[PDB]
Amino acid sequence: AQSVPYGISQIKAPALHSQGYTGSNVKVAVIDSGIDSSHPDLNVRGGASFVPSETNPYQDGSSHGTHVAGTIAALNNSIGVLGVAPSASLYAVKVLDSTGSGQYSWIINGIEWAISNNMDVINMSLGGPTGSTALKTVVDKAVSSGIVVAAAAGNEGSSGSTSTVGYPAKYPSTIAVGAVNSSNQRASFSSVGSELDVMAPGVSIQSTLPGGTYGAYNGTSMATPHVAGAAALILSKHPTWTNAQVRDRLESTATYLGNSFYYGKGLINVQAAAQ
């Protein structure tokens, strides 16, 4: 039997599914540690690896890319879980190795691939404390080219009034995504600051793991794919909307949760966004 993880329902994805919108034909690049393309609850349409030691993007030694992929697009069937956008076209863009880390050159090469291959949405469930002008240039290029770029805000918690949002989420061109639990409470680890844009479910998120199994993780990396999947739902209903329009709807229609420094505009609501 299939289960619907709570976060899928919490962002109101099932309302879109009932309208007949499931992300069909929307191309979503998971820029991460690979995706296990053999998982029975995933359909990976293509991909590319930019990790020199791991030339197969369709294998994931970390688990993170596969987990994120399932939150975006786990198939609607008799098994496993259900993604936000279960008909979306998934692409495995491997820029992190089996340890879950990668060089900025590798990440940049993955983003360039996504641009060249006309992706609609990029999910970057990754981040770090240091900027790079090369990274900002390619992220901004992706956005200018029309791609929705969702990025994990980071898991650095709070530190008084200091922003703890990491890169590339800190850049204005990305949607920086923080984490709430099933009660819409901010997770203590969720990064904060002026750059934080929206929240999504990021605590005890059940998804696909390599080898055909499932399990729960915590992090803003689990929140991010809810937003990437939501963007794919919106584009499946509104195929002419630009990335800027999709982003403005996701942010503006969010359920306000409190102080924007901690919550941004609040919890995404894809039903309201896609109206």
220: contact with Ca ion by CB under 5 A = no
Tell me which of 2, 38, 55, 118 binds Ca ion, using CB under 5 A: 2
Interhelix angle 133-144/104-116, nearest 10 degrees: 10
d(CA 173, CA 142): 9
Closest CA to 54 of 36, 41, 42, 73: 36
> Could you confirm whether 226 is annotated as catalytic?
no
Known binder of ligand: residue 174? yes
d(CA 230, CA 69): 13
Tell me which of 66, 125, 163, 174 binds Ca ion, using CB under 5 A: 174
Which of 61, 70 has the CB closer to Ca ion? 70
77: contact with Ca ion by CB under 5 A = yes
Choice among 17, 39, 64, 226 that is catalytic:
64
Known binder of ligand: residue 171? yes
Choice among 32, 36, 97, 120 that is catalytic:
32
193: contact with Ca ion by CB under 5 A = no
Choice among 63, 125, 207, 221 that is catalytic:
221
d(CA 89, CA 246): 18
> Could you confirm whether 32 is annotated as catalytic?
yes
d(CA 257, CA 184): 7
Known binder of ligand: residue 26? no
Cis preceding-peptide flag for 210 (omega within 30 of 0) = no
Tell me which of 36, 41, 97, 156 binds Ca ion, using CB under 5 A: 41
- The least CB distance from residue 173 to Ca ion, in Å, is 7
d(CA 148, CA 232): 9
Tell me which of 69, 176, 187, 205 binds Ca ion, using CB under 5 A: 176
> Could you confirm whether 221 is annotated as catalytic?
yes
80: contact with Ca ion by CB under 5 A = yes
Tell me which of 195, 209, 232, 235 binds Ca ion, using CB under 5 A: 195
25 Cβ contact partners less than 8 Å away, ≥ 6 residues apart: 87, 89, 236, 239
Identify which range of 69-77, 136-144, 224-232, 235-243 contacts Ca ion by CB under 5 A.
69-77
Which of 49, 220 has the CB closer to Ca ion? 220
End-to-end CA distance of the chain, in Å?
31
Identify which range of 38-46, 116-124, 155-163, 252-260 contacts Ca ion by CB under 5 A.
38-46
Q: Which residue carries 């901010």 as its tokens?
A: 186
154 Cβ contact partners less than 8 Å away, ≥ 6 residues apart: 127, 164, 165, 166, 169, 191, 220
Residues lying near Ca ion in the complex (CB under 5 A)? 2, 41, 74-75, 77, 80, 174, 176, 195
Q: Which residues are annotated as a binding site for Ca(2+)?
A: 41, 75, 77, 79, 81, 169, 171, 174, 197
Active-site residues, by number, are 32, 64, 221
